[PDB]
Amino acid sequence: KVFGRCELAAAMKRHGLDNYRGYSLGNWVCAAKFESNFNTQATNRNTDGSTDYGILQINSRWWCNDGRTPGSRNLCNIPCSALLSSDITASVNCAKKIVSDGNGMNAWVAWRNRCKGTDVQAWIRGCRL
Ligand SMILES: [Cl-]
Ligand SMILES: [Cl-]
Ligand code: NA
Ligand SMILES: [Ru+3]
Ligand SMILES: [Ru+3]
């Protein structure tokens, strides 16, 4: 499912990401835009053989099991496939664990490079929330 921008802002809010660990909703939308272009099915292989999955490109090195990332962890206790569902519940719950881990949203390289320090509130402009 490719979410619309406001559609995804609404779902993220519903699931409690608005100001989670202090990050306003626009941060999460911006991260999703540049991680996956709002496509829940997005996947991308990393150099180390790990893979990023879903709307927030959560990595199999630490967070989810895909059966093919040797020596990895599954800290969200989920198959990485669950991160590709049209329902974002699993992504959001796992993102909450990630963002709580110490480096906040810097965990997401695209957030750090493309969202951090920018006017992220623009990502939710015009949305009914
Ligand atoms: Cl594995
Ligand atoms: Cl922080
Ligand atoms: Na894993
Ligand atoms: Ru850790
Ligand atoms: Ru503005």
Short mmCIF file of N, CA, C and O in Angstrom, two decimals, residues 25-116:
data_model
loop_
_atom_site.label_atom_id
_atom_site.label_comp_id
_atom_site.label_asym_id
_atom_site.label_seq_id
_atom_site.Cartn_x
_atom_site.Cartn_y
_atom_site.Cartn_z
N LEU A 25 4.92 14.67 14.85
CA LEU A 25 4.45 13.87 13.75
C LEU A 25 5.13 14.14 12.40
O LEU A 25 5.39 13.21 11.59
N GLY A 26 5.44 15.39 12.11
CA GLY A 26 6.05 15.68 10.84
C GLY A 26 7.41 14.94 10.67
O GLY A 26 7.83 14.64 9.53
N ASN A 27 8.13 14.69 11.78
CA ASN A 27 9.40 13.95 11.68
C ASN A 27 9.21 12.56 11.16
O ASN A 27 9.98 12.10 10.35
N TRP A 28 8.11 11.95 11.58
CA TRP A 28 7.84 10.58 11.24
C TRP A 28 7.38 10.48 9.81
O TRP A 28 7.79 9.55 9.11
N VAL A 29 6.59 11.47 9.36
CA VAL A 29 6.12 11.48 7.99
C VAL A 29 7.29 11.70 7.02
O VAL A 29 7.42 11.01 6.03
N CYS A 30 8.17 12.65 7.36
CA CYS A 30 9.32 12.99 6.58
C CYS A 30 10.21 11.77 6.48
O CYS A 30 10.69 11.44 5.39
N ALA A 31 10.41 11.07 7.60
CA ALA A 31 11.29 9.87 7.57
C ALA A 31 10.68 8.87 6.61
O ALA A 31 11.38 8.38 5.75
N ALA A 32 9.37 8.63 6.71
CA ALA A 32 8.68 7.64 5.88
C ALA A 32 8.75 7.97 4.39
O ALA A 32 8.93 7.10 3.54
N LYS A 33 8.63 9.25 4.08
CA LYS A 33 8.68 9.74 2.72
C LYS A 33 10.03 9.36 2.07
O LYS A 33 10.09 8.78 0.98
N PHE A 34 11.11 9.65 2.80
CA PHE A 34 12.46 9.45 2.24
C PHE A 34 13.00 8.00 2.41
O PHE A 34 13.83 7.53 1.61
N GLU A 35 12.45 7.27 3.36
CA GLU A 35 12.80 5.83 3.56
C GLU A 35 12.13 4.99 2.52
O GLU A 35 12.80 4.17 1.87
N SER A 36 10.83 5.21 2.29
CA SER A 36 10.03 4.29 1.47
C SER A 36 9.15 4.95 0.48
O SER A 36 8.45 4.21 -0.20
N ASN A 37 9.11 6.30 0.42
CA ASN A 37 8.07 7.00 -0.44
C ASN A 37 6.66 6.56 -0.12
O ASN A 37 5.76 6.51 -0.99
N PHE A 38 6.45 6.24 1.16
CA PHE A 38 5.19 5.94 1.78
C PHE A 38 4.67 4.55 1.31
O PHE A 38 3.49 4.19 1.51
N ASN A 39 5.56 3.72 0.77
CA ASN A 39 5.18 2.37 0.30
C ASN A 39 5.51 1.29 1.32
O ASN A 39 6.72 1.05 1.60
N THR A 40 4.47 0.64 1.86
CA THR A 40 4.63 -0.34 2.92
C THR A 40 5.42 -1.55 2.42
O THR A 40 5.95 -2.29 3.21
N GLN A 41 5.40 -1.77 1.12
CA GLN A 41 6.14 -2.93 0.53
C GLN A 41 7.61 -2.69 0.20
O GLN A 41 8.24 -3.57 -0.36
N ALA A 42 8.14 -1.51 0.48
CA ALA A 42 9.50 -1.18 0.10
C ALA A 42 10.52 -2.13 0.86
O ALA A 42 10.39 -2.34 2.05
N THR A 43 11.53 -2.57 0.16
CA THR A 43 12.63 -3.36 0.70
C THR A 43 13.90 -2.85 0.06
O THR A 43 13.90 -2.44 -1.15
N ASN A 44 15.00 -2.90 0.81
CA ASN A 44 16.29 -2.49 0.32
C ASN A 44 17.41 -3.24 1.04
O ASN A 44 17.51 -3.22 2.27
N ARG A 45 18.25 -3.87 0.24
CA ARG A 45 19.35 -4.69 0.76
C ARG A 45 20.46 -3.78 1.14
O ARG A 45 20.81 -2.89 0.37
N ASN A 46 21.05 -4.05 2.31
CA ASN A 46 22.22 -3.31 2.74
C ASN A 46 23.48 -4.10 2.40
O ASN A 46 23.44 -5.34 2.16
N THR A 47 24.61 -3.40 2.45
CA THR A 47 25.90 -4.00 2.12
C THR A 47 26.25 -5.23 2.96
O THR A 47 26.83 -6.18 2.44
N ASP A 48 25.89 -5.20 4.24
CA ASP A 48 26.24 -6.28 5.15
C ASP A 48 25.36 -7.51 4.95
O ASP A 48 25.50 -8.45 5.72
N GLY A 49 24.43 -7.51 3.96
CA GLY A 49 23.52 -8.63 3.73
C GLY A 49 22.24 -8.53 4.54
O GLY A 49 21.32 -9.38 4.40
N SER A 50 22.14 -7.50 5.39
CA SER A 50 20.89 -7.27 6.09
C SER A 50 19.94 -6.58 5.06
O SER A 50 20.38 -6.13 4.01
N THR A 51 18.67 -6.48 5.43
CA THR A 51 17.62 -5.84 4.58
C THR A 51 16.77 -4.89 5.47
O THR A 51 16.41 -5.19 6.63
N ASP A 52 16.37 -3.80 4.84
CA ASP A 52 15.42 -2.86 5.41
C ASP A 52 14.02 -3.09 4.83
O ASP A 52 13.88 -3.31 3.60
N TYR A 53 13.04 -3.05 5.72
CA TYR A 53 11.69 -3.44 5.40
C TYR A 53 10.68 -2.37 5.80
O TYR A 53 10.65 -1.89 6.91
N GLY A 54 9.78 -2.09 4.88
CA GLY A 54 8.54 -1.35 5.17
C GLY A 54 8.62 0.16 5.11
O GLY A 54 9.60 0.77 4.71
N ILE A 55 7.56 0.77 5.57
CA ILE A 55 7.40 2.22 5.52
C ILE A 55 8.53 2.98 6.20
O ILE A 55 8.90 4.08 5.74
N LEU A 56 9.13 2.39 7.24
CA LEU A 56 10.26 3.04 7.97
C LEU A 56 11.59 2.23 7.85
O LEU A 56 12.55 2.53 8.50
N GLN A 57 11.65 1.34 6.86
CA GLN A 57 12.87 0.69 6.49
C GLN A 57 13.65 0.16 7.68
O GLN A 57 14.83 0.49 7.84
N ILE A 58 12.94 -0.65 8.45
CA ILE A 58 13.48 -1.27 9.69
C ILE A 58 14.36 -2.45 9.30
O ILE A 58 13.97 -3.26 8.46
N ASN A 59 15.53 -2.53 9.95
CA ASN A 59 16.57 -3.39 9.48
C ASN A 59 16.58 -4.74 10.21
O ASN A 59 16.33 -4.81 11.42
N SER A 60 16.89 -5.81 9.45
CA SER A 60 16.87 -7.14 9.95
C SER A 60 18.14 -7.47 10.83
O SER A 60 18.19 -8.50 11.52
N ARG A 61 19.11 -6.56 10.85
CA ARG A 61 20.37 -6.78 11.62
C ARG A 61 20.03 -6.82 13.08
O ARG A 61 20.65 -7.58 13.81
N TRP A 62 19.03 -6.02 13.50
CA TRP A 62 18.63 -5.92 14.88
C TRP A 62 17.21 -6.17 15.23
O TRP A 62 16.91 -6.60 16.35
N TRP A 63 16.28 -5.81 14.33
CA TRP A 63 14.91 -5.56 14.79
C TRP A 63 13.91 -6.63 14.40
O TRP A 63 12.90 -6.78 15.04
N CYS A 64 14.19 -7.39 13.33
CA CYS A 64 13.14 -8.35 12.84
C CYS A 64 13.82 -9.58 12.24
O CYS A 64 14.96 -9.47 11.85
N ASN A 65 13.16 -10.76 12.28
CA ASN A 65 13.76 -11.91 11.69
C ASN A 65 13.33 -12.09 10.23
O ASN A 65 12.14 -12.19 9.94
N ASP A 66 14.29 -12.22 9.36
CA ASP A 66 14.02 -12.63 8.00
C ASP A 66 14.65 -13.99 7.61
O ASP A 66 14.50 -14.42 6.45
N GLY A 67 15.34 -14.63 8.55
CA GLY A 67 15.99 -15.91 8.33
C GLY A 67 17.26 -15.88 7.50
O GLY A 67 17.89 -16.91 7.26
N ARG A 68 17.69 -14.70 7.08
CA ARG A 68 18.86 -14.65 6.22
C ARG A 68 19.80 -13.53 6.57
O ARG A 68 20.53 -13.04 5.71
N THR A 69 19.87 -13.17 7.84
CA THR A 69 20.83 -12.15 8.26
C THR A 69 21.68 -12.73 9.41
O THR A 69 21.41 -12.49 10.59
N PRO A 70 22.73 -13.47 9.05
CA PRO A 70 23.50 -14.22 10.06
C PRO A 70 23.99 -13.38 11.22
O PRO A 70 24.50 -12.28 11.03
N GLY A 71 23.75 -13.90 12.41
CA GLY A 71 24.24 -13.26 13.62
C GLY A 71 23.37 -12.08 14.03
O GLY A 71 23.76 -11.34 14.92
N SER A 72 22.21 -11.90 13.37
CA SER A 72 21.34 -10.77 13.68
C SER A 72 20.42 -11.03 14.88
O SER A 72 20.31 -12.15 15.42
N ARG A 73 19.77 -9.96 15.32
CA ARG A 73 18.81 -10.05 16.39
C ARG A 73 17.42 -9.76 15.83
O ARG A 73 17.29 -9.33 14.68
N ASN A 74 16.41 -10.07 16.63
CA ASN A 74 15.00 -9.81 16.31
C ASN A 74 14.40 -9.12 17.52
O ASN A 74 13.54 -9.66 18.18
N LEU A 75 14.86 -7.91 17.79
CA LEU A 75 14.46 -7.21 19.03
C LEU A 75 12.99 -6.84 19.05
O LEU A 75 12.38 -6.69 20.14
N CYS A 76 12.33 -6.71 17.88
CA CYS A 76 10.86 -6.42 17.90
C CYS A 76 10.03 -7.70 17.93
O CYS A 76 8.80 -7.65 17.93
N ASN A 77 10.69 -8.84 17.93
CA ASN A 77 10.03 -10.16 17.98
C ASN A 77 8.98 -10.35 16.90
O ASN A 77 7.84 -10.68 17.15
N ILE A 78 9.39 -10.07 15.66
CA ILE A 78 8.48 -10.16 14.53
C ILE A 78 9.25 -10.65 13.31
O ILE A 78 10.45 -10.40 13.18
N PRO A 79 8.52 -11.35 12.42
CA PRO A 79 9.06 -11.60 11.08
C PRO A 79 9.14 -10.29 10.35
O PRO A 79 8.21 -9.50 10.43
N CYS A 80 10.19 -10.05 9.59
CA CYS A 80 10.31 -8.82 8.81
C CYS A 80 9.18 -8.62 7.85
O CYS A 80 8.80 -7.49 7.58
N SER A 81 8.61 -9.70 7.32
CA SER A 81 7.39 -9.57 6.50
C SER A 81 6.21 -8.80 7.10
O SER A 81 5.39 -8.18 6.35
N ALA A 82 6.06 -8.86 8.42
CA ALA A 82 4.98 -8.17 9.09
C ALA A 82 5.15 -6.68 8.92
O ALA A 82 4.19 -5.89 9.04
N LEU A 83 6.36 -6.28 8.62
CA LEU A 83 6.68 -4.86 8.40
C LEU A 83 6.29 -4.35 7.01
O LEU A 83 6.45 -3.13 6.72
N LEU A 84 5.76 -5.26 6.16
CA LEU A 84 5.34 -4.87 4.83
C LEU A 84 3.82 -4.82 4.62
O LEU A 84 3.33 -4.51 3.49
N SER A 85 3.08 -5.10 5.68
CA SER A 85 1.66 -5.07 5.66
C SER A 85 1.04 -3.68 5.38
O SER A 85 1.57 -2.62 5.72
N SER A 86 -0.16 -3.69 4.81
CA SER A 86 -0.90 -2.45 4.63
C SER A 86 -1.28 -1.82 5.97
O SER A 86 -1.50 -0.64 6.02
N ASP A 87 -1.35 -2.60 7.05
CA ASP A 87 -1.57 -2.09 8.38
C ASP A 87 -0.19 -1.84 9.02
O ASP A 87 0.63 -2.74 9.18
N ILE A 88 0.02 -0.60 9.43
CA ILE A 88 1.36 -0.18 9.89
C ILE A 88 1.65 -0.48 11.34
O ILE A 88 2.67 -0.04 11.88
N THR A 89 0.73 -1.18 12.02
CA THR A 89 0.85 -1.41 13.44
C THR A 89 2.22 -1.97 13.82
O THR A 89 2.89 -1.46 14.77
N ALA A 90 2.65 -2.99 13.11
CA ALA A 90 3.92 -3.64 13.45
C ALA A 90 5.06 -2.67 13.22
O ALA A 90 5.98 -2.62 14.03
N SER A 91 5.02 -1.89 12.13
CA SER A 91 6.12 -0.94 11.89
C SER A 91 6.22 0.06 13.02
O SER A 91 7.29 0.41 13.51
N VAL A 92 5.05 0.54 13.43
CA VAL A 92 5.00 1.63 14.39
C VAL A 92 5.49 1.13 15.72
O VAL A 92 6.27 1.80 16.39
N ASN A 93 5.04 -0.06 16.12
CA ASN A 93 5.45 -0.59 17.41
C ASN A 93 6.91 -0.83 17.49
O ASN A 93 7.52 -0.61 18.55
N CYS A 94 7.51 -1.27 16.37
CA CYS A 94 8.92 -1.55 16.34
C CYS A 94 9.71 -0.22 16.31
O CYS A 94 10.75 -0.08 17.00
N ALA A 95 9.20 0.77 15.56
CA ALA A 95 9.83 2.07 15.51
C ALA A 95 9.90 2.69 16.88
O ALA A 95 10.86 3.44 17.22
N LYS A 96 8.89 2.43 17.70
CA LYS A 96 8.92 2.95 19.06
C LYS A 96 10.07 2.37 19.88
O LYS A 96 10.75 3.10 20.62
N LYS A 97 10.34 1.09 19.69
CA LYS A 97 11.46 0.46 20.35
C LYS A 97 12.82 1.05 19.85
O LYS A 97 13.72 1.31 20.64
N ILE A 98 12.91 1.23 18.53
CA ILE A 98 14.11 1.73 17.90
C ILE A 98 14.41 3.12 18.44
O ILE A 98 15.52 3.39 18.83
N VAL A 99 13.44 4.00 18.40
CA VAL A 99 13.66 5.40 18.68
C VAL A 99 13.95 5.62 20.17
O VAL A 99 14.46 6.69 20.54
N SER A 100 13.58 4.63 21.00
CA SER A 100 13.82 4.65 22.42
C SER A 100 15.26 4.19 22.76
O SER A 100 15.66 4.24 23.89
N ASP A 101 16.02 3.69 21.79
CA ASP A 101 17.24 2.91 22.06
C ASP A 101 18.46 3.75 22.47
O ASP A 101 19.45 3.18 22.93
N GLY A 102 18.40 5.08 22.34
CA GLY A 102 19.54 5.96 22.71
C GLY A 102 19.90 7.06 21.72
O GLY A 102 20.28 8.18 22.12
N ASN A 103 19.76 6.78 20.40
CA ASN A 103 20.11 7.75 19.39
C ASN A 103 18.90 8.42 18.76
O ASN A 103 19.06 9.15 17.82
N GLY A 104 17.71 8.18 19.34
CA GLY A 104 16.48 8.81 18.92
C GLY A 104 16.31 8.53 17.43
O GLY A 104 16.57 7.39 16.99
N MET A 105 15.92 9.54 16.68
CA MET A 105 15.63 9.28 15.22
C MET A 105 16.87 9.21 14.34
O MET A 105 16.78 8.86 13.17
N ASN A 106 18.04 9.50 14.91
CA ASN A 106 19.30 9.30 14.17
C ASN A 106 19.52 7.87 13.69
O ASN A 106 20.33 7.66 12.80
N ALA A 107 18.84 6.91 14.32
CA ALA A 107 18.68 5.51 13.86
C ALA A 107 18.33 5.44 12.38
O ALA A 107 18.80 4.55 11.66
N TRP A 108 17.53 6.41 11.91
CA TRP A 108 17.15 6.47 10.48
C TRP A 108 18.05 7.41 9.71
O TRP A 108 18.02 8.65 9.89
N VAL A 109 18.97 6.82 8.92
CA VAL A 109 19.95 7.67 8.20
C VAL A 109 19.26 8.72 7.32
O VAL A 109 19.74 9.87 7.30
N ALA A 110 18.17 8.38 6.67
CA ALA A 110 17.50 9.35 5.83
C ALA A 110 16.87 10.47 6.68
O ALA A 110 16.70 11.57 6.17
N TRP A 111 16.45 10.16 7.90
CA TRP A 111 15.89 11.22 8.75
C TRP A 111 17.03 12.18 9.08
O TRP A 111 16.88 13.42 8.98
N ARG A 112 18.15 11.62 9.54
CA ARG A 112 19.26 12.47 9.89
C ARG A 112 19.72 13.34 8.72
O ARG A 112 19.96 14.55 8.88
N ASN A 113 19.81 12.74 7.53
CA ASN A 113 20.31 13.50 6.37
C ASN A 113 19.30 14.40 5.66
O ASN A 113 19.69 15.37 5.03
N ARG A 114 18.01 14.10 5.75
CA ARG A 114 17.02 14.78 4.90
C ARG A 114 15.90 15.45 5.68
O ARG A 114 15.17 16.29 5.11
N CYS A 115 15.80 15.15 6.98
CA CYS A 115 14.66 15.66 7.79
C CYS A 115 15.13 16.49 8.96
O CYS A 115 14.57 17.58 9.24
N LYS A 116 16.11 15.96 9.69
CA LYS A 116 16.68 16.63 10.86
C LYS A 116 16.96 18.08 10.58
O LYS A 116 17.71 18.39 9.63
#
